[PDB]
Amino acid sequence: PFEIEVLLPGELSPAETSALQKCEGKIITFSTLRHRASLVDIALSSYYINGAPPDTLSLLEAYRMRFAAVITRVIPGKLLAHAIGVGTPTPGLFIQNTSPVDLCNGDYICLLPPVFGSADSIRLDSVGLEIVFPLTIPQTLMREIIAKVVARAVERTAAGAQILPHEVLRGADVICYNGRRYELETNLQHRDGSDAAIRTLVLNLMFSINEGCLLLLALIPTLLVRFPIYETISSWISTSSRLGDTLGTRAILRVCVFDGPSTVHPGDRTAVIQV
Amino acid sequence: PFEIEVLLPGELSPAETSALQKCEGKIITFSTLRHRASLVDIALSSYYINGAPPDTLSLLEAYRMRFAAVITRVIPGKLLAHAIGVGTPTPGLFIQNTSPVDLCNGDYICLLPPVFGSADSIRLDSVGLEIVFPLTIPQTLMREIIAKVVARAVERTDVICYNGRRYELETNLQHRDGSDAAIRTLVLNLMFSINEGCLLLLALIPTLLVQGAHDGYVNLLIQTANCVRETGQLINIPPMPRIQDGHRRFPIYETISSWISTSSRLGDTLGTRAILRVCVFDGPSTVHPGDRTAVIQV
Amino acid sequence: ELAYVRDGVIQFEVQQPMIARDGPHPVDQPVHNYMVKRIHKRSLSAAFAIASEALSLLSNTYVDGTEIDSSLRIRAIQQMARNLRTVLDSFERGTADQLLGVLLEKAPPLSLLSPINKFQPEGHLNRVARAALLSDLKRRVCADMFFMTRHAREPRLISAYLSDMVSCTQPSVMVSRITHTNTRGRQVDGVLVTTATLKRQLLQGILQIDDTAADVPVTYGEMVLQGTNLVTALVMGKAVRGMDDVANARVPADLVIVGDKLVFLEALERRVYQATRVAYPLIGNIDITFIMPMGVFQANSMDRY
Amino acid sequence: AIASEALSLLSNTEIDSSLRIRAIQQMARNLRTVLDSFERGTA
Amino acid sequence: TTQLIQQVSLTDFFRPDIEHAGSIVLILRHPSDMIGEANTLTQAGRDPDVLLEGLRNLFNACTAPWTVGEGGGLRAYVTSLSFIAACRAEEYTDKQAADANRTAIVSAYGCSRMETRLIRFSECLRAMVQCHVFPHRFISFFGSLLEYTIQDNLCNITAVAKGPQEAARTDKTSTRRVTANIPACVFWDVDKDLHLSADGLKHVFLVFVYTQRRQREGVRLHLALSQLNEQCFGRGIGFLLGRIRAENAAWGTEGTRALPLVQLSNDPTSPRCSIGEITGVNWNLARQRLYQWTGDFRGLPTQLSCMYAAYTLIGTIPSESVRYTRRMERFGGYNVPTIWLEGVVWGGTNTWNECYY
Amino acid sequence: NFTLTQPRAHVDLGVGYTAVCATAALRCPLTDMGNTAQNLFFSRGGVPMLHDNVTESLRRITASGGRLNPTEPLPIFGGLRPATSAGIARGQASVCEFVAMPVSTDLQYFRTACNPRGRASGMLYMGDRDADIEAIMFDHTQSDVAYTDRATLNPWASQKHSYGDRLYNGTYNLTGASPIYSPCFKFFTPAEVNTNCNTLDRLLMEAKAVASQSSTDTEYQFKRPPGSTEMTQDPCGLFQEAYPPLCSSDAAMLRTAHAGETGADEVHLAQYLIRDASPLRGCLPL
Amino acid sequence: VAYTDRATLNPWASQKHSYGDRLYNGTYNLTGASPIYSPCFKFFTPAE
Structure with a gap:
């Protein structure tokens, strides 16, 4: 009936301790289930x-x-940590805001690490x-964000492959919410994730859609005014099932702030809870 | 909390008691939950x-x-069981392994009736x-089993590979009660995918073919694309469709969203929903098949 | 010991005085009317958040057998006692500053009562009397302005102010007139709050200290209700009280005499309201409008001579 | 059923004491009545 | 285990004094993204001028233009569902009680200058439904509201996730236990197939009807109470609304043959052109002899215009032999239909699915 | 967390005169006269416009003055407002309503203050007639108490249902909560009043218990945010009278070149001086 | 900011790149041996 506490580096560099104190409020990923997770990141790539x-x-x-996991203050000699995953529940947890996007209480929230552009991270030379x-x-x-990203990537690939320009100005593409402006695809350079991993x-997805639409258009419509020819269909069904299974639905996060402020910005007092 | 109580019928004891003792960690399932539970409405019904x-x-x-429904250790006093709707797990509800292939933590395993080798049957005299x-x-x-079944049904209108292991299977065309539903x-x-985005996707087929001359992924994409790459080059198709609403809204986004929605709906309908995630503690997750496996509630 | 009183109101027998004429009018009979009021409610909540370190330290039950944990526990309990004392003092200060002002809407009686006792004999006014009253009110609000502030250097308007106020003050009730008096035997009037500079100016000008008597009697106690009365009140729902009308700390306090009135001034500008997030009360605001012409001319022509 | 009354008595200076005494008396009367009913059923 | 959320409210759009305790409210969201996505949602099938005029008159009718319009920061979060429930109850073949209930509601809560605002809101929602903007993505669920207070144009609205009906015991009135009464006159009768003995953990489905008729399109509140999963309920909603689904499909088709290429692709010795395509000397000279098929996309530009199912799995109850009970009370001269629903718990995640099978 | 709550009740026993208040002080000014424009173009409906080439020039001309104006894309929808610019230490700007009246105006009426409403009204008739209140303000056919021979002034500005009620009052849901708010709307609609036993309480509650309608934190004269806590009084909002400030046709006479003492001229050629109704000449050097 | 009626005061030296800025400003000091003093630089750069 005990818990697991993270290690505390004693007598470290002043710069390292200052960086750890500055990043203390930031969310820290949990370690492995059994003993420790230190070489997993190195061995991942x-x-x-x-x-x-492919990572x-x-x-x-x-x-x-x-x-x-949620970290606590650093005390020289003894360190304290709190965990609510498999251990014991805690009476409230304080985590600083990280996502710049506006959030509303009383609604189910999900978690998804972005892979387009850049994301906040902490790295130490030593x-x-x-x-x-x-x-x-x-x-x-x-869902809307990922659909828009996929559509933008598809249109960019089409423009780059067709040689001649094919982008048609359909109007303004600025998303405004609670006085916050969000412009997407503002540049067409340094795209290190647009056509690298996805x-x-x-x-x-495109070739599966093409084969499916061809198969349906072959004989399905009727009111409009040695090769079994089944291995391809079976492979398409298998790939569709695999992608549907790997899509996932990670809806376990929730936001509930007691008498919190209306506007939300990174660097506020929020709460972390599950369902 | 709330739990389903199981009654003990009289004038019967030895054979079922021995079967329960031998089962140990084996669990069962119930359809209707009430103040009391019976045994007839599981298989006979x-x-x-x-x-x-049918099968x-x-x-x-x-x-x-x-x-x-889970089953804990049976005591001579009465039958004890726990429901999945409560959030107070108790150690002792570990189940046995009934799969020839060992499992490990990190897989969302669903439930399905045994069809590759059926299951043993125990005759009850009470x-x-x-x-x-x-x-x-x-x-x-x-997933691949149901794909083969639906392909065979379509053909009507047998060997699988798994890490070098292959074995003969049986047919599933004796019952047509689900064939019409699948059709x-x-x-x-198919009728939900009549959008015009497929024409735009096919308009880049020659460009993709040209770009793939040095990509190196053709040796792996040939197996997954054996008829689409031939049918796409046998149709001329309009290269530049007439623009009617592209100057106001982007149509590919709607088609992509509809395709994603229908694919997710099909996946949910086919794969249904699982029960729980299996996680073990103490020793390594590698558990020999046919032995005790630790099951916890997440 | 109250849960649902439905805004109860005490009962009393008070008859307003009436004038007597005995002129050209026959014998009449007295007429009285009964009215009801309402009781408001207020509440105040306080909180003091804390981390889990205090409870983790207090949930050890001497798991190590040393003096370091005992010292940590004693410092934690001292800190929590100090925090409790601080929040209690803050709550007391908040209630003290909230207790001042309950009728600020009708607080100024002069501008809303002087004409009533100056021109209206009994409140019955005809058209000409109403017109005269309206003209007098408009003249007063047009000529008043800041005349008192402009002529503040002349210390002789106090006599006029008291003469005007003596025609509008009426005695209070006599039944519930229990109060604490000084050693001289003169009943007090009330508590006045003013700025420090105003209090100093009043003290240097008129108010002279001549009395020294301060006390803090504790006589309210804690009344209790018998079980029989409680059950006989809760069987029907209505709660009864009374049934009697058959037929430590030291704080300086002084008093002053200004003739026929005994009013004491208590101003605490530096003692309290120091380093507090609450703004100073009694800060009112006024509004006014102005009208100006733009391109106006006379109608006639024989005026530029 | 005994959970409702027990929870009301547990989770909720003379009115409170009288209410507690009345609740205790009612609980004792209910227990006596249920014991008599059980005895009659057994008989 | 107790969580509370505080929200602000106004007085010109909501009067907490009329509403009693135990009511159920739903949190809305500002249409900041909806006003921008309506251009794509309307598509070439209809015009966006009607929606623009509707939103313009809605903004004009709405008070405090300096706050609302681009953000729900200083707007009324909590909105009474009684008004919309009564408005959407007209198409339910049961109006004798609805008219009697609404005659006093309009006289007391309404009057003054409210008919113009009500008509403007009705026409705005009719235009939104007609244009198929899908405004149901802002409806959520909350617990009972047993506490309310307001001093001056500021209501301290509080709510909880679960329902402590069996453990609250506020003892703030003559009653001994708390309760939550909410009318359910829009509960759809789905017992025609489950009239037999069915008991257990019944599930509540919040189904929204999306009709595609001629000038009679609207969304009406519906409720269900039956122990079913997401597959059987979906199949029932699929093959039970066949007539209306076919009518919507026929109305939405506001407007092509087979091909023998499959046979020649299946048989061997098929004409393959790969080296010529790679070289590029016959990039366009080889495709001129192919099959044009004379394909046209004017037959059906869109297919998602026939959606009629918007059920959400919100609300659970483990009590056996469920049976609603309706009594009569008075609030000073006007009776109110209340249903005794106390000592129950609810929870779960929202599943907004658009099914058009 | 430890939360403690204790209900408290307070009763009163003094129905008559008990509270005494007498204050006379001046603080730092917060707002002064402004020179801002008005958002007249925000009509939301009216005569159709098709001369874009001249309307753009008119918009550019009216925006080059330096007053508030929308952004370049002309956001006629939503609640977009121009960004607040810096301001010198002069006070807070405010709107200035314009009323079209004949040039011929009596000098005595201007000297003795003018009524923006047009005619004084009084609801002290004990409800003798429902139409009596409207008659005395929209009759314009009987002699007034201020004019021995005339009835109403500004015949081109005071009307019944053509100009006054159409624009100055605002009906058919045309007031709203726009930043350009008329301060005279607070006493235009009589609305409904409550009854009581005596008239003293009625007049006390009529002359008091007035809430704020705007905020002085911004120079744009925005509406009062919900949840604010402030107290203010409007003594001139019920008297229907406002004394004119110290103004003159020519500043040469007001400059007081001679200085020292002061004089009084009865008849002059074209120079006239009006004494201010508020004697505040000795407070602060003006 | 002061008087909204007019545009600006002294437009000849209100652009941070005028003749005075080219000559002295507060940190230019392009002269070789001119006898500069404090006011010639303190009138343009009032520290930070």
């Missing part, structure tokens, strides 16, 4: 096999299958270990 | 009211209409009912 190591899917799966903070967004808004997934 | 007893559709319907043992077959295995669902899904 070890199978480069003479090329870019987006692996990190997404790790974040979905791993819980979180440590060599980096931690990526996932962004928490509601599922309803997340390119294979979007290509598979 | 499922196999009745149909005339010809796939009726079992799937019973599993969908049923719930999750009432005359059988007990169905749940299995932990991986999701991809049942209707696939017809509706």
